[PDB]
Amino acid sequence: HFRKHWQERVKVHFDQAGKKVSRRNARATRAAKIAPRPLDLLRPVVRAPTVKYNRKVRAGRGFTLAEVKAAGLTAAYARTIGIAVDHRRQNRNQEIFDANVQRLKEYQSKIIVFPRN
Amino acid sequence: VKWPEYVRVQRQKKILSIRLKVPPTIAQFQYTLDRNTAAETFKLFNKYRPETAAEKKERLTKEAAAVAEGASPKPYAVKYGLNHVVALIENKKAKLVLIANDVDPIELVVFLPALCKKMGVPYAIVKGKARLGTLVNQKTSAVAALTEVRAEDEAALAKLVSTIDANFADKYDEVKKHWGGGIL
Amino acid sequence: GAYKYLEELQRKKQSDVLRFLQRVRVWEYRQKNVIHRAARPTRPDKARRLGYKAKQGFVIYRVRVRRGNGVNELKYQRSLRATAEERVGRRAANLRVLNSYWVNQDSTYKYFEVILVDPQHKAIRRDARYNWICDPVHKHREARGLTATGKKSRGINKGHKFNNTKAGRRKTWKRQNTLSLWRYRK
Amino acid sequence: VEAMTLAHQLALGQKNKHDLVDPDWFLEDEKEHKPITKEAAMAIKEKIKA
Amino acid sequence: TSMTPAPKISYKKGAASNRTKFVRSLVREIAGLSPYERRLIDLIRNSGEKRARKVAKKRLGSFTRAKAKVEEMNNIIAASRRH
Amino acid sequence: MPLTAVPEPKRRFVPSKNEAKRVMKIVRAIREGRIIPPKKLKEMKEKEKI
Amino acid sequence: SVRKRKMNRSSVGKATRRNKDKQRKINIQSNPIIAANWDYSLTMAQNYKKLGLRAKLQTPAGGKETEVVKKLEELASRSQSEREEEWLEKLYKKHGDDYKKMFFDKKLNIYQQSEGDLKRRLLRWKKRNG
RNA sequence: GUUCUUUGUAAAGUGCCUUCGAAGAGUCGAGUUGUUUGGGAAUGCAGCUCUAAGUGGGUGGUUCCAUCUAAAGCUAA
RNA sequence: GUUUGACCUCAAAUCAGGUAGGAGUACCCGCUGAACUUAAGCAUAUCAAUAAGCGGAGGAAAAGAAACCAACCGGGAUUGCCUUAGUAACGGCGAGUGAAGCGGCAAAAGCUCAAAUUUGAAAUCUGGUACCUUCGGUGCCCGAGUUGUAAUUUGGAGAGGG
């Protein structure tokens, strides 16, 4: 596969180390600006499609509205506490829903919220 | 000789409109209310001109001054907003509907007379949107209607509606006849 | 709201009333210059649903464009709507092009109405819902095919049907036709 | 020109009659403001011969 | 197991929103008929749906829309011929 | 029958809230001294311009 | 380059800037308690672990409470206008506990407030007044 | 961290009960001609004849079923 | 009314103030666009949706929160890297062209209008003037707007009340 001018565009990843260092510095800056809160939002536990991988359990974008309601809070208030909320993900597994509810309940207990003022 | 391009275009537009055949939905205007009944309707409407910016500001300032030192009835005025008028119509809330015959977008108001007829609300067409605008402190409104007339003028409004029925709805009940604009 | 009635009426373009309206309007625009400003939009509902507002700063323009394209068989896929938007933007470079809508057409020429917003007017600059258009990155949206017609021409849409140009055909071609080499060869 | 193409199309059984129906300064614009066949174009060009 | 979590936009396919139906009927009455709808009704007056369906199919891209157009034309004719 | 029910709101049977808002805003502005009451404005047409 | 060659040859000098060192040592600026306990010598993850705060919620890639008491301690460490108060005074002195009668009082109850709202306002007035 | 103001019968947050229930047209789509993609399912676009409905429409799949609501717009890494 | 005035359209000011050309151009967004070369000589093909040319932007740009992907115990903005893969697929299966779901990681932010009457008060805003605690704020005035500016709202519903 060398019928083109590929020699004009030969991207060599010499920067790997510098890019990793820059990513670490960006993470440190985010922590400095987001010190009290975690760097990443609490993602749910979800099951994968593509049965070749359905046996695997992996994270997801955010909890569904039903999961948030069952967790004892609201979607609008959940976002401010860093809980990821998905308005398009429908719940179709009772076992996964129970695990998500338990995870949300544990997260609510582990979090401490400072006064709004 | 020569004349301005815009003048020539507008003059030719009149000839085209006169000579061109229009569908029954169009030309429903220009079959307007007679001069006398339209004048009476405008006289009645003038008694209910909505409060203008200056008058409203004066009233609010007077109220503020009175409050600073230490229960009026519901205001009455004509409803003229096209969106507001259309929302009032089809709800059986309007008693009299006025429609301008010179709306620049014709399609904007073709359905309003037919919609009023379907809803049974009395309606009339008057010449000139400028006349409608003048009585509502606006440049143009293209429509005008009454919703809550005072008891003193309730009989006058009822008589005006009854007269307008015969004057316009009965005289022009055949407006759907052969296409207009058939002039040599 | 009367806008629903206007939208429904505009759908029956083949109707006799709309046919006569188009016949009158095409001649009215054919007497005027190729590009001429419009005092008010002829389709208030379409403009309103396209972001039009009856406030100082918004301008409505009308432009005429020739129709048609084996010497003449060359496609030159430049769309008529895109050409009209580019022409009105060039004539109104100080303005910004938001979108355009079909209003009329003729056997020899097409007619489109375009909505423009002046970023210099304080009303737009002080409006939170419209101050975004004043960003320099939004300069000459039509010139880069950022309008609805431009985006449609570029084929930028979700799904497998637009994989070739899901994020720009040139960008995808450059990314795919590039040899990737790491420090530690795989 | 298109009249000759329509006549040629009607000559053969591709289409028939049923398919067919299935101011001076203003008339001038009206007069001045469909697919065609190469065979019909050649036929009309030949017919134009004096 | 099944959970039937909650409805979506696809569940908003409810009634015709009679206000919208009234608006559509008013527009149809005021707007009139298109040049092909005129031919359709003219053939229905004497030829019935036989030719009208074929004309609609030729004008439209599929017969599913042609049958709906024929039904709409018949509904309009029924009211017009008596009301 | 009307095309839709649309239950009426309380704002169509109660004095306008926006009118009260502007009244109170004008009261506050006058209290702050940046708005001369109409009485003083009228009096200035006789206590001044002499 | 063209411009660069002239700039070096020119006597205008250069806008020398040195901030590479400052790009790494970034002082925490979103909390006083953490700042007084944060250690710039250790990494962000190490500092979070020492303080006890969870740096990451998801499982990190690759293998890896006095301060918390201070955070918890942080948890432990509006009257009606004159016109409204006067209106409530009139309502109380003219009707009293007759909420149903007050609801139908066209004169005083220009705003057709519900019985619940009226009694809620009256309770606050009683709490704040005699 | 310290301090001046608020306010006005003003704006929002959850549960329950009562009454209602607006979504983008020369647009989707069809045939023609050109171009382009691995896209054989005709992949997208453009010029042209015609012109769609709201218990509707688009994209897929074993008698039907699975998923979204285009034809308006903004957005930091 | 043999008149005067309302509008609608169209004119000119060295009217008051703003906006545009152009330059740079590695990267970005569109239009236009070949050949040498490679093949079974060759029109399909490859060179190439490249070279050059034109127009429009910034530190990044585009795209971006599905009329998506999938057929599962289903995933849930876009973008970037390994893999999927030199597989599916295309190509006189001829040289050759050639993807995408899923899987592992970086980053993760959602949203704003149209369409239901503020209708018990166009409550919206530009501009001119006098002041001030001048990246703007207040009073006053002409105007833009009712052919729709304020508030709420986008199915994640939503709206009128208790």
UniProtKB/Swiss-Prot annotation, chain A:
GO terms assigned for molecular function: RNA binding; structural constituent of ribosome
Phosphoprotein recorded as keyword: yes
Annotated GO CC locations: cytosol; cytosolic large ribosomal subunit
Keyword Phosphoprotein part of the UniProt annotation: yes
Superkingdom field: Eukaryota
Compartment list: Cytoplasm
Keywords assigned: Cytoplasm, Phosphoprotein, Ribonucleoprotein, Ribosomal protein
A single GO BP: cytoplasmic translation
Self-association and partners: Component of the large ribosomal subunit (LSU). Mature yeast ribosomes consist of a small (40S) and a large (60S) subunit. The 40S small subunit contains 1 molecule of ribosomal RNA (18S rRNA) and 33 different proteins (encoded by 57 genes). The large 60S subunit contains 3 rRNA molecules (25S, 5.8S and 5S rRNA) and 46 different proteins (encoded by 81 genes).
Purpose: Component of the ribosome, a large ribonucleoprotein complex responsible for the synthesis of proteins in the cell. The small ribosomal subunit (SSU) binds messenger RNAs (mRNAs) and translates the encoded message by selecting cognate aminoacyl-transfer RNA (tRNA) molecules. The large subunit (LSU) contains the ribosomal catalytic site termed the peptidyl transferase center (PTC), which catalyzes the formation of peptide bonds, thereby polymerizing the amino acids delivered by tRNAs into a polypeptide chain.
Anything else known: Present with 133000 molecules/cell in log phase SD medium.
Protein family per UniProt: Belongs to the eukaryotic ribosomal protein eL13 family.
Protein name: Large ribosomal subunit protein eL13A
Complete-protein stretch covered: 13 to 129 of 199
Swiss-Prot record, chain C:
Primary site of residence: cytoplasm
Any one GO cellular component localisation term in the record: cytosolic large ribosomal subunit
GO biological process, any: cytoplasmic translation
GO MF terms held by the record: RNA binding; structural constituent of ribosome
Keywords per UniProt: Cytoplasm, Ribonucleoprotein, Ribosomal protein
NCBIfam families recorded: PRK04243.1 (NF003269)
Other observations noted: There are 2 genes for eL15 in yeast.
Family, similarity comment: Belongs to the eukaryotic ribosomal protein eL15 family.
Protein name per the record: Large ribosomal subunit protein eL15A
Gene coding for it: RPL15A
UniProtKB/Swiss-Prot annotation, chain E:
UniProt keyword annotations, A-Z: Acetylation, Cytoplasm, Ribonucleoprotein, Ribosomal protein
GO cellular component: cytosol; cytosolic large ribosomal subunit
Subcellular compartments: Cytoplasm
Keyword Amino-acid biosynthesis (UniProt): no
Coiled coil: none
Gene Ontology MF term list: RNA binding; structural constituent of ribosome
Highest taxon in the source lineage: Eukaryota
GO terms (BP aspect): cytoplasmic translation
Modifications the protein undergoes after translation, according to the UniProt entry: N-terminally acetylated by acetyltransferase NatA.
Family stated for the protein in its record: Belongs to the eukaryotic ribosomal protein eL36 family.
Further remark: Present with 31600 molecules/cell in log phase SD medium.
Stated name of the protein: Large ribosomal subunit protein eL36A
Source species: Saccharomyces cerevisiae (strain ATCC 204508 / S288c) (Baker's yeast)
Region of the whole protein represented: 18 to 100 of 100
From Swiss-Prot, chain G:
Top-rank lineage group of the source organism: Eukaryota
Biased segments, Basic residues type: 1-8, 15-25
Positions bearing Phosphoserine: 79, 81
Subcellular location: Nucleus, Nucleolus
GO cellular component assignments: nucleolus; nucleus; preribosome, large subunit precursor
Signal peptide bounds: none
InterPro entries (UniProt xref): Ribosome_biogenesis_Nop16
Keyword Transmembrane in record: no
Main localization (coarse): nucleus
GO BP, one annotated term: ribosomal large subunit biogenesis
Region (Disordered): 1-28
Keyword list, A-Z: Nucleus, Phosphoprotein, Ribonucleoprotein, Ribosome biogenesis, rRNA processing
Subunit structure and binding partners: Component of the pre-66S ribosomal particle. Interacts with NOP7, RRP1 and RRP15.
Similarity-based family: Belongs to the NOP16 family.
Biological role stated in the UniProt entry: Involved in the biogenesis of the 60S ribosomal subunit.
Note: Present with 2860 molecules/cell in log phase SD medium.
Protein name (record): Nucleolar protein 16
Organism: Saccharomyces cerevisiae (strain ATCC 204508 / S288c)
Gene designation per UniProt: NOP16
